[PDB]
Symmetry: C4
Subunit: 306 residues, 4 copies
């Protein structure tokens, strides 16, 4: 069988093949376990596939997944995990920014009785205040969104057990927020503190933030249609107050004060409509993601359902 599966998404990653493979063989032979290296070429434009082919010729542990197009790092990672058959699957980066020597340590934490072992950086390490505070705010928001409290400073370097991988493959979602989905499974999780070696705008970021906020939970859709419906009721109210202030207290003010009532009433009514729609939209969202109701960790006395 295959015990470990190192998944490497690669796009324009030539000139890094030799050093990365040397480090991986250096750190994976002391483990004395049967491993595999699933390298997912994400439509590289340079001579990366040629060197990947040569490496796969030389070594029987490298397996290449060649995507038709450049789908992206997240999608290439998803393909690699889908084609990984090891008991533990470790996504790693091809630029070696996250050290591979920590893979060993990750394996140990996986053998302590854990299922997800995140690799959390010591501290931002670079990324001036402008980024640390934004990361803090986003992490607090998402931690309030979920009920599992994924660790801060988590990236795409991690260890997932076969249970975790099977659970992730059990979610048929196209709008994916990986951190939220990894929290949403909630197995025996942990994190290993690693320090990145001493060696993005707000257009690629803001889009990622919106994808995390909207494609994971209904909380933006629930907080709204709750702020609306606080107003609207406060607009239908005071619209009635204006009705009962013109009916008593004869209207000696400007002759078209009733316009205000209209501006409130329809508006408030419209908001209610929106709220209702939003609620149902959220329900439809939950229905179209088709998430499983539950995930089973272990069974005693029962075989697993098909």
């Amino acid at each position: 069988t295959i015990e470990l599966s190192i998944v490497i998404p690669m796009y324009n990653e030539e000139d890094n093949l030799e050093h990365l493979f040397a480090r991986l063989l250096e750190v994976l032979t002391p483990l004395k376990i049967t491993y595999e290296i699933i390298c997912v070429n994400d439509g590289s434009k340079d001579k990366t596939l040629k060197q990947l082919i040569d490496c796969y010729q030389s070594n029987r542990q490298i397996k290449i997944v060649n995507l038709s197009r450049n789908f992206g790092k997240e999608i290439a990672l998803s393909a690699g995990i889908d084609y990984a058959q090891g008991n533990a699957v470790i996504p790693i980066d091809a630029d070696l920014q996250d050290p591979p020597e920590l893979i060993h340590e990750l394996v140990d934490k996986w053998r302590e009785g854990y299922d997800i072992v995140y690799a959390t950086r010591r501290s931002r390490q670079g990324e001036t205040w402008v980024k640390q505070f934004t990361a803090k705010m986003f992490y607090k928001v998402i931690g309030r969104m979920t009920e599992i409290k994924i660790p801060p400073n988590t990236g795409d370097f991690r260890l997932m057990d076969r249970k975790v991988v099977n659970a992730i493959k059990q979610l048929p979602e196209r709008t994916r927020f990986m951190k939220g989905l990894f929290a949403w499974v909630g197995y025996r999780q942990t994190f290993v503190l690693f320090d990145r070696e001493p060696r993005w705008n707000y257009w690629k970021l803001w889009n990622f933030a919106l994808d995390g906020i909207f494609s994971f939970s209904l909380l933006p859709l629930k907080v709204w249609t709750y702020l609306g419906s606080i107003i609207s009721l406060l607009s239908l109210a005071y619209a009635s107050f204006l009705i009962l202030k013109t009916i008593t207290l004869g209207v000696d003010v400007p002759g078209y004060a009733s316009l205000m009532v209209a501006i409130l009433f329809l508006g408030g009514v419209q908001l209610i409509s929106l709220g209702v729609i939003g609620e149902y939209l959220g329900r439809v969202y939950e229905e179209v993601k088709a998430r499983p109701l539950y995930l089973v960790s272990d069974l005693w006395g029962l075989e697993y359902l098909p």
Copy 2:
């Protein structure tokens, strides 16, 4: 073959395992029917899983379903029912608030030919009047929402036949209102009255909102109806004001086009919202993917796969 399946959602249920299992075994012994007890551990931080393991090692009727995390009582019950293989499935609470001896009566009713046998509280005694009013009103609203009239004062303590369990498992809804869903699967249903031995208010709101919105389109159909009525009234009165400006030349304030624009735009946007809501309700009904019908019996035909 297992005849009865007692499904218990467990969460921090230590200091209750020995007593609950003792009462359940005492009740189920005189039945003389092959039974199984499925304990669904709902991601408890407490040590109930270890004692569940001990009991499963001691008693061969105990089967444990360990969930990945805490999913809630509803989802834990759904998992336990999905793993249950008995002909009749009885959800029950580990706290033993619901008397397990009532299981006797339940199975007796199941022997009369009733597919669903609810267990309903004889009364709630001199309880808080606010609950006595709110629960009654919510039950009346739900009863108007369905056409089957599910009994009131009913919790998760029920007996479901294998046909009812299979029908429920045929509903792939991820947004579930179990009371309305059990009404929707309209097999032969009855109830047994029991007296219990002598609230978040946020869950009480979220569950009510689920019951209103996660089951039917009736709230969405009474709206886009009232909204359409209000929009039509707005359009009619805007037309009246247009005619009032056109005939009699009303211009006293000297700007009676703001109100016409307000009414016309509000009515048009309200009709647009009503059409969008109608189509969104169709989308919701289609994504819920409920089966069109449900066959309770067949004569001369074999069941379709």
Copy 3:
């Protein structure tokens, strides 16, 4: 094999069972084909199921589909068609509103090469003015929606070939307008004319609220034309608001601000309303796309093949 299936939805049809079955055996026997009679008990509260059991035990051509609840006539028909294994399936009503003898003519048309044969009533003769005109208008509107232009004065009494039954079973949609669905799956279609007997031409009170519900279901559950006429009649309004809001802006800049202290109000109203109307139109277009995706009808329906095998 089973040449013909007779699907009868049933709800409190006690005391109608004997005459219905007598007429059915009267008409179906001379056809000298192998037939089955699928009686769909739609949760009847009367003693219908017991007499159904008696007939099934004494007659081998009766099969019973007992529905758990009362799902309605349309869903009972869907269940019966789902359980019907005949090459041709004929829905029919248990109250003998439609003469079963006409079944014979239907079968004849079925042997002429037609895949759907409708049973069309020649005249209404039970609806003085309002119902016939409203039905004509509704049929014209739904035919404008549909392609094959399903004939009018028609009901659930019909015949479908096994190809048509399988094609209808190929649509996994829950919000169904079967009148339009039978036209969307176009196949060699025809219609035979029949006259309702004078014994059953009474007023048949037309519950107007149920009529309205059926009309809304048919209009809003078969096509997106209500959502496409709007998002066009609403986008025109939005455009004509943004314009003339710009015109008010240029008029106030050019012709002065003689307004009493307003026209910021009117420009704001027009601009916000038009922007929200564009937003509602975009939401409507994408919701129509979501609706079409969610319905998940097959792209095409192959009638016959030559040189190729059918796709599983």
Copy 4:
């Protein structure tokens, strides 16, 4: 093993079958490969089916797909491609605007290594100002939405590898814009130039909107952003009127709270519409059910089921 699948959608294509098949044979026989013609009769209201039947009886290479009714040219092409079992699929027209000789050239490019070989006309020539400029603008707007830059002046004459055909069949979309779908499933594409040899609003507008909307979320994402800026400006400017009315009072005539109410409610409704649009786009992405990735080649691994 069929090396080539020609797909001809026909609707009322009588008096042109013999010429079409003569040209197809004169083009395909020199290729010296096993070819297979599939005639998709798109519910013709004509006697073309009889001629197709006689041709199929006489010649073995011709097979027929008869649709229930007239579905459209795109749907007929999809039906023919679904039934096509060749290693390469070449959708061609029965009218023969596209020269079948280019099939040769297309096949040649297919043997160079490319997976999709488009057949693009060099220039419109006859179209002077309106049609060519509007086509250029449409392609320019579409290109930003698409991931791979499709070539200009393209049509439905192309060669698609079995790998590309399988990838396309993996997309279960009911609202299909094939020009963008072929770009989304990017592979080794290319194009071959050729000459075609010497516009109602209810199609050239419906198709354009279908491509704009039914393919990508870009129109919905460009809005709900601009609308959000408009909402933010409305709310900020309403706050400005509030701060202007609490300072120095209200020198404007005393009915200027109407502006505040209008701006605030419009901004709140615009935020609601923006949230609804964002979640509707998420639902659209979920329901289009496009696969996350597409695998072109594998080394050391077997293709997943």
